């Protein structure tokens, strides 16, 4: 029959979970955001659509930090994103309190994974309307991740989601081939700025604001920090230049 797509934890005859898939539609309808793993860190960047001149510039920050070494950015229903970071934060505090050492990125990823996977087990809840790219530096390296509303996640070299995910993925794949040795944090920041600018074409109708953050063993001491001032403008320019 039909109706398999009205309740959240129901398996359709072909083994799918339609509500999780409809959740994805909410994600694809959102702003584009990416992540780039470099030789000793990771960079996050996102597109911020300037609805009007009334939005105070630089104020509505979207990227979020978890603990002191993890960055998270997402596309879709913003509120759902925050909800997930809040849990991530409790998840990280709990881990540090018991084990003393700040939470490893792989461990943190599964914490977010199990939580999201949990929201696809009952019809009393709705799946998350966001895909999340997060990562940081830990005891052994840098790690980048993307988490889908299904709770599925994998480690990435580069990642993108949202409106212009295809352009982004395309640009990302180029970098992967032309740099088997590894991109530097400094470079990744610029490259990132470009990818957002490019991918912004799939939304070229509205003006936007660029936002970047990074976590590099050498550039930030392994702590997640936002890219501001000079380093920011320098990347904006590098983009504005290669956009023509």
């Amino acid at each position: 029959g039909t109706g398999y797509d009205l309740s959240n934890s129901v398996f359709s005859p072909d083994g799918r979970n339609f509500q999780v898939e409809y959740a994805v539609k909410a994600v694809e309808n959102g702003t584009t955001s990416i992540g780039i793993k470099c030789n000793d860190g990771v960079v996050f960047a996102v597109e911020k659509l300037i609805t009007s001149k009334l939005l105070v510039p630089q104020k509505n920050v979207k990227i979020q930090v978890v603990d002191r070494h993890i960055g998270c950015v997402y596309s879709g229903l913003i509120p759902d994103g925050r909800h997930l970071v809040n849990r991530g934060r409790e998840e990280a505090a709990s881990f540090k309190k018991l084990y003393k050492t700040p939470i490893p990125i792989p461990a943190f990823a599964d914490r977010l994974g199990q939580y999201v996977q949990a929201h696809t087990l009952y019809n009393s809840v709705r799946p998350f309307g966001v895909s999340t790219i997060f990562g940081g530096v830990d005891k052994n390296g840098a790690h980048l991740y993307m988490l889908e509303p299904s709770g599925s996640y994998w480690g990435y070299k580069g990642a993108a989601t949202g409106k212009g995910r295809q352009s982004a993925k395309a640009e990302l794949e180029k970098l992967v081939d032309h740099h088997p040795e590894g991109l530097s944090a400094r470079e990744a920041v610029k490259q990132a700025a470009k990818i957002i600018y490019l991918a912004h074409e799939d939304n070229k109708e509205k003006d936007f604001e660029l936002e970047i953050s990074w976590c590099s063993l050498s550039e930030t001491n392994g702590l997640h920090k936002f890219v501001k001032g000079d380093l920011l403008q320098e990347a904006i320019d590098f983009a504005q230049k290669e956009i023509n």
């Binding site: 009205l6 309740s7 019809n123 009393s124």
Partner: protein, 244 residues
């Protein structure tokens, strides 16, 4: 949500009837017939075993006559398993009363309690009612011999003679035809067998398809005695009454 799958077992029909109760009663009408006849010197409970086989162990069987107290027994018509749940709680209530007042529980008090429990499944909880109807045969020192009946709705009433289960209309008419206030246990025993004999949906009425019990006050004693007839005992009385 879950609301979607809720049958709503406790609501009124536009006519002001309780669906579930009505359907449960319908269920009961296909159950083996059980008769209750009250005499001046005792009470008779008789029931027809629904479905039987050559291999069914009858000596170890009991599916319709249960002892609640040493002074109260019931005849069951409906889901055996549901009856057993209610019977056990009925047995506990009897003992609670005994321990509290150091007196056996008056027959009506026990019946009203069991009926109140049933009434509950009728007004709250969202659960199906018990597909059971009871005929209570008991004795106490305030009303002596008493015969009651309770059904899924939670209503109960007193009778000189009554039946529950299949063909009650036919059974009731036959009883109302030959019953007489001054009857004697032996007379009632015979009436009961004749009634079942004419309402059976089976070929003949044999002992292997019956359960029999009497609550008498054995003259040579002064106390009340319940007697759940044994296979052979039923076989005998079946010949004597002229049914062979």
């Amino acid at each position: 949500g879950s609301r979607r799958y809720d049958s709503r077992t406790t609501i009124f029909s536009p006519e002001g009837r309780l669906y579930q109760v009505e359907y449960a009663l319908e269920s009961i009408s296909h159950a083996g017939t059980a008769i209750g006849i009250m005499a001046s010197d005792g009470i008779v409970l008789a029931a027809e075993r629904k479905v039987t086989s050559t291999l069914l162990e009858q000596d170890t069987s009991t599916e319709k006559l249960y002892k609640l107290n040493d002074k109260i027994a019931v005849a069951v018509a409906g889901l055996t398993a549901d009856a057993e749940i209610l019977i056990n709680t009925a047995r506990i209530h009897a003992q609670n009363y005994l321990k509290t007042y150091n007196e056996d529980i008056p027959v009506e008090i026990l019946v009203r309690r069991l009926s109140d429990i049933k009434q509950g499944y009728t007004q709250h909880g969202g659960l199906r009612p018990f597909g059971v109807s009871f005929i209570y045969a008991g004795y106490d020192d305030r009303y002596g011999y008493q015969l009651y009946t309770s059904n899924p709705s939670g209503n109960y009433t007193g009778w000189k003679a009554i039946s529950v289960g299949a063909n009650t209309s036919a059974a009731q008419t036959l009883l109302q035809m030959d019953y007489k206030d001054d009857m004697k246990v032996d007379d009632a025993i015979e009436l009961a067998l004749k009634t079942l004999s004419k309402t059976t949906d089976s070929s003949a009425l044999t002992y292997d398809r019956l359960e029999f019990a009497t609550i008498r006050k054995g003259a040579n004693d002064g106390e009340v005695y319940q007697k759940i007839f044994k296979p052979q005992e039923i076989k005998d009385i079946l010949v004597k009454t002229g049914i062979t």
